[PDB]
Amino acid sequence: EHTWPDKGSLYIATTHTQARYALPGVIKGFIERYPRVSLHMHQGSPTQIAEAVSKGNADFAIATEALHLYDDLVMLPCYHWNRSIVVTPDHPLAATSSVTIEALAQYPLVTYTFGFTGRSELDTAFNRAGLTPRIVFTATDADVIKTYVRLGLGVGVIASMAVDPLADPDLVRIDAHDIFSHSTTKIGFRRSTFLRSYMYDFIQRFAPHLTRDVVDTAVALRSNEEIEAMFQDIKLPEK
Template sequence: FTGRSELDTAFNKVGLTPKVVFTATDADVIKTYVRMGMGVGVIASMAIDKEQDHDLVAIDASHIFSASTTSIGFRRGTFLRSYMFDFMVRFAPHLTRPVVEQALSLKSSAEIEEMFKDIELPVR
């Protein structure tokens, strides 16, 4: 999730008003606080490791939260090494080296968004 307002919107949409004492954006931090008995946490399903998190109960709440897209970011002008391209294509198979290089050749974020607008993204 990108922030607290997104969580508030999702809960309000289904008529819930959670009592939030504090928030964290890192799934491991959230899981640690839950393990300490400090309440419940909301994390992405991909952050659950069935072996490592066997002590936690994960309940599907996808009916409350809308899907979100994760982006890969790097500073313009950075020399991208081959291992960086390897990571990108493993993370998102549509981000091949030629596709990333084409995106780098564009001048604005709007042009990059336009380039990717018709690409069907995988859902996890």
């Protein structure tokens, strides 16, 4: 209908990438739908994020899957995403017909800060291929990464959701989905958290397969591993 009168607060701890490219539409929709809920969002490192909902006052952790770190939280898979290579049109990569990771490792890289927004998968891929990449520029934000790629500092590696040809018309995007293993964005919370109906609403808005029932089943499992296995038959959203 119109709006809910529900009343309460919703504290989110998340990353730049989620805050910037994944959440604004969800949050806009939620804000008009749930007028009397005080929404809070604090960008943090994956460590800070886990700490914030684990020890602090965040209700929800929204971040890409990071080891046994969200271990004592209820973690739910929301969507899969991967990386795009960003270069200038005059870059040797732009000419190259199919670009591999040995071709990519030839160049200085401009990408995410270590342990952020799935850097691990980039590192792991290089380790696996026995290659040592020259990472010269590092940041939390795809925007400045793009800025420095356009100055010729090197080859950008960002999240594909952080690119758009409409808003970055002077760049060349190369999909690296066959180059890196995909990353999974997860939503998480403390088990002791009483899940308000707006909390269910929000979760399902951000992750449609996560209906109230499914969420309730997941908390009943008491393993994040079993929770992820719940969905191994279905194709999760790709972003």
